[PDB]
Amino acid sequence: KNLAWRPKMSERTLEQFVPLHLAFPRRHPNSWQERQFHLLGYVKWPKEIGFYNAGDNFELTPQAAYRIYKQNCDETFWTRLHNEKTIIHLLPLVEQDPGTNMVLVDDIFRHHLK
Amino acid sequence: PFKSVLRRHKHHPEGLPLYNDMSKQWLCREGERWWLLDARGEQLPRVAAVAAQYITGQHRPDFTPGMITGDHVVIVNIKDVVMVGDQWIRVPITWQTAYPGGKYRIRLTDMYERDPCMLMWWFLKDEVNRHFVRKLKTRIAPLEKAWLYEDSIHPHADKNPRPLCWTDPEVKGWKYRDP
Amino acid sequence: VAQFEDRPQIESRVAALADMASTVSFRSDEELLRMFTAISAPFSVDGRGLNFLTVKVSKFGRPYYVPNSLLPAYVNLVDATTI
Amino acid sequence: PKKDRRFRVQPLPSLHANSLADDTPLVTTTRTLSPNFRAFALQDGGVFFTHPSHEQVMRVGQNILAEETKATGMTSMDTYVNSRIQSIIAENTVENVALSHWRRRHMWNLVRTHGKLQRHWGVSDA
Amino acid sequence: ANGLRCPDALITRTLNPLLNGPKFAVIYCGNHQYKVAVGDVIAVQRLRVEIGSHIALKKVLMVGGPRFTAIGRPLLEGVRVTAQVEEQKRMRNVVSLFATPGRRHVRWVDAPHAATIIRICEIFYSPNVVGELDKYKGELLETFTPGQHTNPVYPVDDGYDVFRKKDKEAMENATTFLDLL
Amino acid sequence: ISEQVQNRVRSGKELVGTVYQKARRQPWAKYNGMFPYDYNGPARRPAASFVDAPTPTHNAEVCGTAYA
Amino acid sequence: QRRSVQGTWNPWLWNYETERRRTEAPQWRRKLSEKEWDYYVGQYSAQMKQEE
Amino acid sequence: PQMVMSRDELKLRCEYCRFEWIHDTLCVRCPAQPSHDQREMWLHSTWMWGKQQ
Numbered sequence: 001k002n003l004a005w006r007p008k009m010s011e012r013t014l015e016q017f018v019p020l021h022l023a024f025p026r027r028h029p030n031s032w033q034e035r036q037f038h039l040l041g042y043v044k045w046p047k048e049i050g051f052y053n054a055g056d057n058f059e060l061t062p063q064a065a066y067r068i069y070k071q072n073c074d075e076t077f078w079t080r081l082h083n084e085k086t087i088i089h090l091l092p093l094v095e096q097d098p099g100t101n102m103v104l105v106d107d108i109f110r111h112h113l114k
Numbered sequence: 115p116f117k118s119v120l121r122r123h124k125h126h127p128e129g130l131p132l133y134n135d136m137s138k139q140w141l142c143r144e145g146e147r148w149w150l151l152d153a154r155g156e157q158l159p160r161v162a163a164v165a166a167q168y169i170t171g172q173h174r175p176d177f178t179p180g181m182i183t184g185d186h187v188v189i190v191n192i193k194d195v196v197m198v199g200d201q202w203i204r205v206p207i208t209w210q211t212a213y214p215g216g217k218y219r220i221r222l223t224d225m226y227e228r229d230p231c232m233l234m235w236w237f238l239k240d241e242v243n244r245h246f247v248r249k250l251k252t253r254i255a256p257l258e259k260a261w262l263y264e265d266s267i268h269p270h271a272d273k274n275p276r277p278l279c280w281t282d283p284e285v286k287g288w289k290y291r292d293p
Numbered sequence: 294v295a296q297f298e299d300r301p302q303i304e305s306r307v308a309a310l311a312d313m314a315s316t317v318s319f320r321s322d323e324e325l326l327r328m329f330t331a332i333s334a335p336f337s338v339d340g341r342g343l344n345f346l347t348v349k350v351s352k353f354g355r356p357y358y359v360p361n362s363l364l365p366a367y368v369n370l371v372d373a374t375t376i
Numbered sequence: 377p378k379k380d381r382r383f384r385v386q387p388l389p390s391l392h393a394n395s396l397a398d399d400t401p402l403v404t405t406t407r408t409l410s411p412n413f414r415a416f417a418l419q420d421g422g423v424f425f426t427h428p429s430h431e432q433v434m435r436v437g438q439n440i441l442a443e444e445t446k447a448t449g450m451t452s453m454d455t456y457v458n459s460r461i462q463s464i465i466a467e468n469t470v471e472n473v474a475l476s477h478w479r480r481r482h483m484w485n486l487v488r489t490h491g492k493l494q495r496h497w498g499v500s501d502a
Numbered sequence: 503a504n505g506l507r508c509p510d511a512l513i514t515r516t517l518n519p520l521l522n523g524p525k526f527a528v529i530y531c532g533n534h535q536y537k538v539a540v541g542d543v544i545a546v547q548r549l550r551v552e553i554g555s556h557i558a559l560k561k562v563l564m565v566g567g568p569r570f571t572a573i574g575r576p577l578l579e580g581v582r583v584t585a586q587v588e589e590q591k592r593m594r595n596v597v598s599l600f601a602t603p604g605r606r607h608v609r610w611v612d613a614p615h616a617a618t619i620i621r622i623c624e625i626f627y628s629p630n631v632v633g634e635l636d637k638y639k640g641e642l643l644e645t646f647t648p649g650q651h652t653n654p655v656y657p658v659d660d661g662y663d664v665f666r667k668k669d670k671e672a673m674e675n676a677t678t679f680l681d682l683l
Numbered sequence: 684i685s686e687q688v689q690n691r692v693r694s695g696k697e698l699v700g701t702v703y704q705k706a707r708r709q710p711w712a713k714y715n716g717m718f719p720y721d722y723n724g725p726a727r728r729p730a731a732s733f734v735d736a737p738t739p740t741h742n743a744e745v746c747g748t749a750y751a
Numbered sequence: 752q753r754r755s756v757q758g759t760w761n762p763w764l765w766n767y768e769t770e771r772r773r774t775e776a777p778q779w780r781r782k783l784s785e786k787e788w789d790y791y792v793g794q795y796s797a798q799m800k801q802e803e
Numbered sequence: 804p805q806m807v808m809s810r811d812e813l814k815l816r817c818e819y820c821r822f823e824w825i826h827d828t829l830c831v832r833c834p835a836q837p838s839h840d841q842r843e844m845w846l847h848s849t850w851m852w853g854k855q856q
């Protein structure tokens with residue numbers, strides 16, 4: 001009869017308070033995080049290639065993306081959306097140095113148009 | 115007799131001693147060092163085990179059973195401690211009060227509601243009592259060398275706790291086996 | 294300070310402290326130095342600092358120790374100083 | 377039958393089956409001071425290890441401690457620890473009395489009282 | 503002590519000063535292993551030896567100084583451990599008492615444990631070394647240089663693991679001195 | 684792969700482009716319970732490895748944040 | 752009597768050692784050489800190719 | 804609702820009857836004619852270990 005531990009309420013009243021969808025005291029330890037990374041077929045890449053940024057999002061590096069383009073220009077699976085995605089990846093480079101990156105955009109442009 | 119009948123008691127105003135501040139034959143504080151255990155993501159029971167062994171003094175090569183010499187472990191982030199699967203909801207904590215009605219069956223979730231710190235204290239109690247039961251001074255004295263802080267704010271900057279780098283070798287999740 | 298030294302008895306000590314803890318803010322710096330000097334008299338670094346013990350209470354198994362009115366007097370001095 | 381209360385060894389990281397292959401020992405110790413232990417081959421078939429001495433290892437420890445505490449300064453625990461490394465390197469003997477004893481007896485240097493009863497380094501007949 | 507011996511000169515002149523000063527040995531005697539110093543006293547199980555005699559001990563598991571350690575695979579050659587028989591006596595009685603609850607039979611068995619008490623005099627060591635030995639890759643290293651680490655040792659941080667627990671950065675980048683120089 | 688296959692194959696069963704969405708989101712209605720990989724951990728798969736990668740020249744140099 | 756020739760274990764002699772690696776680390780953040788660029792981009796393009 | 808011995812003994816009796824999940828326990832609910840409701844007999848929604856095996 002401590003009431004901090006065994007309160008005066010029936011289990012019928014109290015069973016609504018049992019969390020079945022439990023959030024904060026989490027069920028996933030740290031040791032698993034890497035393992036569950038591997039089973040999903042994901043691959044750790046070096047910083048040049050890309051990375052998972054603050055929102056845990058995998059963003060592909062510019063000058064990394066352009067090389068992926070220059071390997072994959074003529075590939076069968078390479079669709080026209082891949083080109084515009086590549087160009088989208090090049091934009092910060094476009095602003096911070098327009099002289100040497102508009103040539104890249106024009107390369108993708110001409111190659112796409114042919 | 116050797117051990118007296120007039121004994122220090124909980125209702126007696128003299129009060130119960132703190133073994134950290136006590137000076138006794140079997141208490142050596144000279145060669146201890148302070149550790150920092152971040153509990154984020156690590157399973158409660160495992161953390162309890164590691165902490166229990168630093169605290170008890172078993173991690174030393176010169177460790178002797180009757181000589182209690184521990185390291186102070188500052189266990190930080192008790193709130194983020196991870197218990198696997200349904201266990202938060204299914205793992206009991208049972209104790210028996212001596213009086214009519216000797217059963218308190220209380221879920222981990224409820225103990226976590228009241229204090230998160232009491233969970234870590236509970237499993238520390240268990241992992242220390244696993245090797246020491248039969249003498250009170252050997253049970254109680256180590257436990258005071260745990261400092262349980264449920265987030266990243268602690269008074270102990272002055273002891274320069276060294277981050278205790280530990281990875282649990284056990285792959286599987288903890289398993290509740292208690293008869 | 295005169296009342297503290299000239300009448301060494303317990304009640305005059307308490308009586309001195311209750312006045313000089315009422316008036317802490319209303320005096321200067323050096324006036325405090327002579328105060329703490331006067332008050333630090335019955336204290337030895339080796340000895341226990343604040344123990345003033347009067348009654349031995351043997352009521353329980355192990356004897357209890359009860360202090361006299363000087364303890365909360367000194368403590369009230371420190372808390373006034375705190376304010 | 378009673379519950380077994382003997383002490384239990386901690387679990388140790390599981391092997392990846394690479395250990396099974398001969399010429400690969402399953403003890404993995406690659407540590408800071410490792411390269412200093414030099415192995416030589418005796419005629420007997422036994423080995424001969426060359427290692428830095430006790431005080432050299434502890435001096436290395438002291439250098440690492442000082443080098444980690446150069447930034448934020450030295451905390452009290454660091455102070456006590458550095459003191460003890462510095463003592464145990466130069467030891468020449470064994471220490472049987474509590475470290476605090478000297479401080480407890482010399483406390484009168486720290487806390488000075490009024491000048492009537494003030495204790496000095498010479499006292500009697502003065 | 504007759505000094506260490508090797509077909510290489512540089513290794514001999516290098517490890518010659520290494521063997522000077524107090525040496526401890528690990529000795530197998532009567533199924534009991536002993537850590538042995540120069541002035542140490544041990545009680546071995548009873549040896550049949552006259553008192554005040556002068557003894558050499560054959561089985562020697564390990565010998566080391568403050569500086570060198572020679573680990574015998576199972577045993578070592580060249581080690582001279584000279585001790586001196588001091589006493590031969592029976593030590594403190596262990597009384598065993600056997601009584602069966604069903605039977606009235608009580609058996610009092612005294613076990614004074616007979617022992618030879620040994621004081622040690624010398625520990626000398628004179629190995630024959632073959633060559634420097636590479637420990638990460640198994641080989642006998644042909645050329646010996648003291649200044650270069652036989653096996654250099656590298657820090658663990660890839661950046662690849664986010665959940666790797668960080669010990670303080672000065673512990674993780676610390677390079678260790680050259681000892682043999 | 685499978686969801687991309689679901690996307691780029693025609694809409695015969697369900698509505699594309701329309702705001703109705705015949706199959707309504709009901710996360711609470713689904714299975715609530717723990718699988719054996721919720722206890723024993725995620726199942727072990729071979730660690731993803733790089734064969735025959737060229738040696739790391741400039742391993743001492745740090746990568747600049749590539750925003751340039 | 753008890754004696755140590757090398758010295759007695761004290762808590763601080765092995766304390767300041769950390770775990771180390773046999774062969775040096777392929778740091779995550781590092782400037783890729785050209786052969787390295789080509790190989791890695793090759794790998795990424797390979798898995799992207801098979802997926803698509 | 805009537806509790807069937809296992810999942811196999813569970814049938815859909817009407818047109819409007821559905822399979823639903825009560826916290827990992829498979830059951831059948833009819834929005835019309837509630838007497839058609841069937842539960843698979845299994846553990847309580849809240850159970851501890853010592854309390855329920």
Ligand SMILES: [Zn+2]
Nearest residue numbers: 816817833839
């Ligand atoms: Zn129906």
